[PDB]
Every structure is written in C-alpha cells, then in structure tokens.
C-alpha cells in the first residue's frame with residue numbers, strides 16, 4: 295500500500311516492520327494495519343507469512359518467555375497454562391453493534407434477552423476508547439492474513455487479524471489457512487477486519503499470572519457487521535481471541551448468510567458409509583461441549599460402518615442449483631475439549647493430537663506427556679503430574695488435573711479419517727440434520743421430525759444442561775436453539791424465518807431432521823446409553839430412514855424407532871423402555887416451558903409457522 299501523507303514522521307509505520315512490507319500489502323490491508331498501529335502503538339509489526347520457519351521460531355520464543363512449554367513425549371506439541379480468570383468464552387461480555395437493537399435480538403417481553411447482547415455504536419465507541427489506545431505499547435502487533443475455507447476456493451472468506459498474542463498467531467495457523475498465500479488470493483478484495491489485544495500494554499500495570507496476559511475486567515468481544523469489523527479486548531482464550539472461528543464464521547457469517555441465501559451454523563459435518571457401500575453426509579448441531587467432535591470423528595462399533603470427518607464445529611451450507619444442500623467446513627483444524635478424550639471414547643482424536651498440537655490448560659506428566667480427567671491411561675509408577683494450575687497433583691486431590699474447558703488445537707489434515715472431500719469447493723451434500731443436547735430426563739434417545747416446519751421448531755425448542763464452554767455454572771437446563779444461542783449474528787426470529795424459507799426454494803431437497811439425546815440418566819444419575827462409538831446404532835437408524843425404510847412409529851413428539859428397529863446386539867443390558875419412554879406429564883411441562891420461552895424471548899418476531907408447531911405439539915400431547 296502507499297505511504298500515508300505526512301507532515302512529520304508519525305503515520306508511516308514502515309520503520310517498525312520486523313517481517314514483511316507495508317508496501318507489498320494491498321492498499322486497504324495497509325490502511326487497516328497502519329491505522330490500528332497508530333491507535334494501539336505497538337513497538338513492532340510482524341506481517342505473518344505462515345511459514346514453518348516462522349511458526350518454529352515463534353513457539354521457541356514463547357518457550358523462552360515461559361508462555362508455553364514443549365511436551366517432550368510428543369512430536370512438536372506444546373502446552374499453555376492460562377490465568378484462571380481467562381479459561382473460556384464469556385457470553386455476557388460478547389456483543390453485537392447495530393443501529394437498531396431489534397436487528398440483533400428480538401425485543402424480549404421480560405426486558406432481558408437470552409438470545410444475544412446488543413450495544414449501541416455510541417456506547418461501543420466509549421468502550422473502545424477506554425481500552426485500545428496505547429494497548430500494544432512495548433509489544434509486537436502480528437498481522438495474520440487468514441482464509442476461512444481452502445486457499446483460493448471461490449467460497450473461502452478472507453480476514454486479517456491483528457493481535458499482540460503469539461499464542462493467537464500459532465493457534466490461528468492451525469485453525470485457519472494462514473500466511474502470504476492468503477494475501478495473494480485476497481488482492482484488492484474485501485476482507486473481515488479483526489482486531490485483538492490481550493489488553494496489557496508494557497510496562498505491566500497489573501500482575502501477570504502464569505505468564506498469561508489478559509485483562510478480565512475490561513474483557514469485551516464486539517462485532518460490528520455493517521463495518522465488517524470484529525474487535526476483541528482482554529481475553530487470550532479460544533473463541534474470544536481466535537477471531538475467524540466463532541466471531542467471523544458464526545456471528546458475522548450467519549448475518550451475511552441471511553442476506554445472501556445460505557447458512558452458517560454450529561454444526562459438525564460427517565460422512566457415514568454403510569455395509570451396503572452407500573455413503574451419506576450428515577450435519578449435527580449440539581451445544582458447546584455436547585458431543586459434536588466425538589460424533590464427527592466417531593469410531594463406529596457396528597461392523598461394516600465407517601465414519602469420516604469433514605468438520606467438527608462450524609458448517610457453511612447452501613442449496614445448489616440442483617437443490618442439494620451442500621456444506622463446507624470453513625476451519626482448518628479442531629479446537630477440541632480435552633477431558634473425556636481417550637482411546638475408548640475418541641481414538642481418532644487420540645491419533646490426531648500426538649503431533650503438531652497445542653494443548654491449553656491440561657496437566658503435564660513428568661515424562662513430558664499430557665493428562666486429563668477421563669484419559670483412561672494408567673501411568674507408570676514414578677511418573678508424576680503437574681496440574682493445569684502448575685502445581686503437583688495426585689489422583690486423590692479435591693480438584694481436576696485439567697481445566698474442564700481445557701482444549702487441544704490440532705490440524706484437521708492429521709485426522710486419520712478426515713474425509714477425502716473435506717477441502718472440496720463444491721462442499722458435500724447433506725441428507726440429514728441432527729439436533730440434540732444434554733437432557734438427563736424425559737427426552738428419548740432419538741426421534742425424527744414430522745416435517746420441515748416441525749424440524750425447525752425442534753431446533754428452536756432445544757434445551758441442554760450448561761457446560762464449561764462459557765461462564766454458566768451448575769447443571770441448569772438452558773435454552774440453546776439450534777446450538778446457536780451464543781452465536782446468532784442477528785435477530786433469532788428472523789433466523790427462524792430464514793430456515794423456514796428453505797422449504798420454498800426451487801427443487802430443494804430438504805434433509806431429514808432428527809433430534810437425539812445421548813445424556814438421558816436413570817434414577818441414580820447413570821447414563822442410560824453408552825454413547826460414543828455406540829451412537830453408530832442411532833446413525834444406522836437415521837440412514838435407513840433417509841433411504842425410506844419402514845422402521846418408524848409415530849408418537850406425539852415425532853417418529854421413533856419401531857420395537858426391534860435399532861441394532862442393540864452387544865448392548866443387551868440397555869433399558870429400552872426407560873431410554874425410549876415418552877411421558878405425558880413430562881411433555882406437558884415441556885411444551886408449557888417452550889411456549890413461555892418463545893413468547894417472552896422471540897415475541898413479535900416469532901414466525902407464525904413456529905407458533906403453529908407449538909400449538910400442534912401441545913395438541914398431540916393433550917391427546918395422550
């Protein structure tokens with residue numbers, strides 16, 4: 295880009311560039327970098343190239359500074375331990391800016407929305423001015439050119455993230471396609487402007503905890519969709535700092551998708567092949583920490599079945615001219631929950647994460663390996679464990695060795711069952727969409743929606759136990775429509791109308807919609823279903839239903855499997871009557887709760903067809 299006009303020497307940052315060239319940048323990229331360098335006052339500017347050399351050097355530097363440790367048991371794996379105040383997303387500090395509050399959330403009858411958080415542009419400018427000026431003093435501003443989707447694919451969307459965190463740079467290299475090639479693909483094109491700071495200018499005004507820079511009191515993750523800007527301050531963690539993922543690929547993208555006729559969803563995409571040599575692709579929306587990654591790379595227990603992974607967390611979809619719903623995964627890696635991961639529950643993940651992987655907030659064994667709750671691998675006598683709090687830890691202690699939201703960040707290309715079509719610009723054709731969450735009571739193992747409009751109601755009605763993925767504590771059952779509650783880019787009522795509208799599209803081949811519950815519990819709080827690989831038994835039923843098999847019985851909530859329709863061979867001890875039971879009293883209460891939630895929270899923007907489905911389900915339940 296060109297040198298800004300100067301009367302002095304205060305606007306051209308060329309002298310502070312320690313890698314790359316402001317002259318080589320597309321004009322608008324340069325204006326974005328330089329304007330924010332003027333504001334944030336970094337000491338240096340490093341334009342990332344995405345090279346192995348760059349990555350190696352940055353890791354070694356974080357190592358020197360004690361920001362990460364090398365895990366010597368594995369090939370090129372690393373461990374970061376965070377300040378305990380910065381361990382997950384914070385939904386209450388995540389906001390979208392629009393002219394009108396109703397463009398961002400429905401206006402709730404109760405006065406507090408549970409479907410996002412809006413802030414006026416005036417208020418945001420005040421918040422911004424209180425945070426960013428001078429915030430990178432003494433630090434390097436890294437400039438990360440990244441593509442969401444394969445390099446140079448016509449359906450890729452490019453962003454530039456400016457950050458003062460090398461941990462964000464390393465993680466973005468895994469989770470996106472990053473570097474010089476992306477600048478070359480971008481040329482003079484438009485890009486999403488992403489600005490991030492950990493919010494700790496040097497010299498440090500506040501103590502540094504665990505070598506992890508963050509500013510919890512001022513944390514704020516903001517989205518300005520008309521300006522095509524994402525602006526995040528104060529957290530270094532995951533969805534708060536890796537701006538291509540939740541902030542761009544769900545919140546900004548879901549709004550663009552509404553405008554342009556596609557969908558951006560909190561969905562895995564998997565391909566499943568049956569023993570008859572037929573393959574179908576399915577998408578599944580489960581809430582944060584409710585099973586997507588474990589389903590997307592499942593090792594099926596049924597013989598003759600194979601699952602392959604296209605993506606585990608975000609799907610971009612659209613109906614093509616032939617009417618097929620085609621999906622792509624915009625990410626380049628998996629940012630997976632670590633606890634619970636074992637050879638038994640997710641062996642494909644175990645294989646993926648043994649090299650080139652960054653782990654955050656897991657425990658470290660004395661021989662340089664990783665540990666967490668549920669890892670299910672005993673250690674040799676003499677091997678000791680350092681918890682994620684950087685303290686010696688024993689199996690008998692009060693607290694977990696790993697944070698409950700600790701994560702691995704691993705290249706998708708390393709997954710042994712990555713799908714051969716995972717980088718195809720044409721996407722893959724989705725034949726079924728699965729909704730579900732954590733429901734310990736009332737909701738059976740699987741059912742099928744009665745129609746498109748009923749299936750959109752089922753997504754809208756989703757509820758699920760809180761998890762550790764954000765700030766919600768305890769196990770309270772929360773609404774999480776479409777697994778998108780933290781992630782809607784715009785008014786949820788309009789999103790429902792957008793989903794409903796797909797029924798009217800030319801030649802549309804609408805996928806079958808299902809709802810599952812892996813998490814139903816008996817009287818003693820034990821799971822009624824073993825899950826993980828055994829979920830292949832439920833996918834088999836869904837496969838047959840997509841093919842038109844007569845394996846369904848009608849109930850008030852939708853179709854369920856006929857007696858004997860599910861393959862339960864090898865699971866003789868499963869209580870089918872309890873797992874599949876539908877109780878009038880439970881469901882009366884459930885439809886009353888959904889009615890009150892939709893009335894309060896969606897109100898004037900609730901599509902008539904969704905209200906109609908609510909009345910229809912209430913009626914079917916009343917006839918029980």
Ligand SMILES: Nc1nc2c(ncn2[C@@H]2O[C@H](COP(=O)(O)OP(=O)(O)OP(=O)(O)O)[C@@H](O)[C@H]2O)c(=O)[nH]1
Pocket residue numbers: 580581582583584585586587588589606607629630631632633634635639763812821824825826829
């Ligand atoms: N009991 C049971 N637990 C499961 C099942 N699938 C996943 N889990 C556990 O639930 C947790 C979350 O699973 P993930 O697959 O990582 O969740 P996710 O939906 O990918 O979450 P995000 O990456 O946060 O969007 C892990 O601790 C898993 O071991 C299942 O079938 N049964």
Ligand SMILES: O=C(O)C(=O)CS(=O)(=O)O
Pocket residue numbers: 382383531532533534539540581582583607629763764
């Ligand atoms: O919370 C989720 O759904 C995640 O996938 C993790 S984060 O990227 O939001 O940190």
Ligand SMILES: [Mn+2]
Pocket residue numbers: 560581582583607
């Ligand atoms: Mn997620």
Ligand SMILES: [Mn+2]
Pocket residue numbers: 586587606607629630631
């Ligand atoms: Mn996941």
Ligand code: NA
Pocket residue numbers: 360361362374375376377503504505506
């Ligand atoms: Na640390």
